C-alpha cells in the first residue's frame, strides 16, 4: 500500500542542530548536509504524505460510494497518471518541485468534486426514493426528474470522464422502478374497475335503450363503451408512460436530432 520514504523526526535533528550551533558546539559536516536537505525536503515530503493519506481516504470513499465510480473518472486517471509518472522521480530530482504542488492541487480538486458528488448524489438518490414513494401523478414525478435533470446539468459543468452513461444507467433504473409503480397503478385500476396504486377514477358510462320508428336499439354503442373504457386505460397508461425520459446529456444545444417519443 502507498507510503513514502521519509521520516519526520528528521526535523527534530534540524531543531537540535539549529539550537546547538547557537550554543557554540562544532558539529560534523555530513549532519549539517543531512539537516540541510531535511530543510529543503521538509514541506514537500509532508505535502506528499497528506496527498497519499487523503488519497487513501478518498480511495475508501469511492470504494464505499462505488455507485458513482463513473463520475470521478477523468480526475481519477489524472491522479493515477500523476502517481504513475511520479514512479520515476527520486529525491535528487528538481522535477518534484512543481510536481508535489500539482499533486496536491489535484488532491484538492478531487476532494472538491467528490464532496460535490456526495451532495448532489445523495440528493438525486433520495429524489429517486421520492419517485419510489409519492403519489401516482405526472406532474409530481416531472419536477422530480426536473430537479434530478438540473442536478445532472450542474454536475455536467465539471465534465468528468464517462459522465453521461451513468445518467443513462439511472434513467433505465427509473424506467424499471416506474414499471413496478405502473404495475401498482394498473392493478389498482383493475380492482377499482370491478367495483401506491394511486386513485383510479373509472367513470359511469351512460346508455339509453332506444326506440326510433319501432326499432329497439342501443344508443350510445357498446363498441363506443368498450372504446371509452380503453380510453380510461390509455389515460391510466399515460401517467407513467409519458413521464419524460432524461437523456445522457442535456447540454446538447446544437443537437435537434434523434428524438423519438420512447427516447423523449
Amino acid at each position: 500500500k502507498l507510503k513514502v520514504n521519509f521520516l519526520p523526526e528528521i526535523i527534530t535533528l534540524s531543531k537540535e542542530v539549529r539550537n546547538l550551533k547557537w550554543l557554540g558546539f562544532r558539529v560534523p559536516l555530513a549532519i549539517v548536509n543531512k539537516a540541510h536537505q531535511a530543510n529543503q525536503l521538509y514541506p514537500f515530503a509532508i505535502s506528499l504524505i497528506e496527498s497519499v493519506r487523503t488519497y487513501e481516504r478518498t480511495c475508501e470513499k469511492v470504494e464505499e460510494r462505488n455507485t458513482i465510480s463513473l463520475l470521478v473518472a477523468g480526475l481519477k486517471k489524472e491522479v493515477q497518471a500523476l502517481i504513475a509518472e511520479g514512479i520515476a522521480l527520486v529525491w535528487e530530482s528538481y522535477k518534484l518541485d512543481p510536481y508535489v504542488q500539482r499533486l496536491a492541487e489535484t488532491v484538492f480538486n478531487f476532494q472538491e468534486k467528490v464532496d460535490d458528488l456526495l451532495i448532489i448524489e445523495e440528493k438525486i438518490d433520495l429524489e429517486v426514493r421520492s419517485l419510489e414513494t409519492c403519489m401516482y401523478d405526472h406532474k409530481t414525478f416531472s419536477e422530480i426528474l426536473n430537479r434530478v435533470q438540473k442536478a445532472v446539468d450542474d454536475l455536467n459543468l465539471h465534465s468528468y470522464s464517462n459522465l453521461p452513461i451513468w445518467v443513462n444507467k439511472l434513467d433505465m433504473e427509473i424506467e424499471r422502478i416506474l414499471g413496478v409503480r405502473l404495475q401498482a397503478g394498473l392493478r389498482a385500476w383493475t380492482q377499482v374497475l370491478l367495483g401506491p396504486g394511486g386513485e383510479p377514477k373509472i367513470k359511469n358510462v351512460v346508455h339509453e335503450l332506444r326506440i326510433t320508428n319501432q326499432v329497439i336499439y342501443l344508443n350510445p354503442p357498446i363498441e363506443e363503451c368498450r372504446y371509452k373504457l380503453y380510453q380510461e386505460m390509455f389515460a391510466w397508461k399515460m401517467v407513467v408512460l409519458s413521464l419524460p425520459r432524461i437523456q445522457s446529456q442535456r447540454y446538447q444545444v446544437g443537437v435537434h436530432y434523434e428524438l423519438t417519443e420512447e427516447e423523449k
Binding site: K1, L2, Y55, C59, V62, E63, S69, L70, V72, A73, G74, K76, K77, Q80, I83, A84, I87, S161, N162, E258
Partner: peptide
C-alpha cells in the same frame, strides 16, 4: 446515422491500479 455509441471508457480503480503499479515495480 444514429448516435453510434463509444466504448466503455473508464477509470480502473485504485486497488487494481495499485496492483498494476505493484507489478510495475515488481518488474522494476
Amino acid at each position: 446515422r444514429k448516435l453510434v455509441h463509444d466504448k466503455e471508457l473508464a477509470a480502473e480503480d485504485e486497488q487494481v491500479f495499485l496492483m498494476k503499479q505493484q507489478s510495475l515495480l515488481a518488474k522494476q
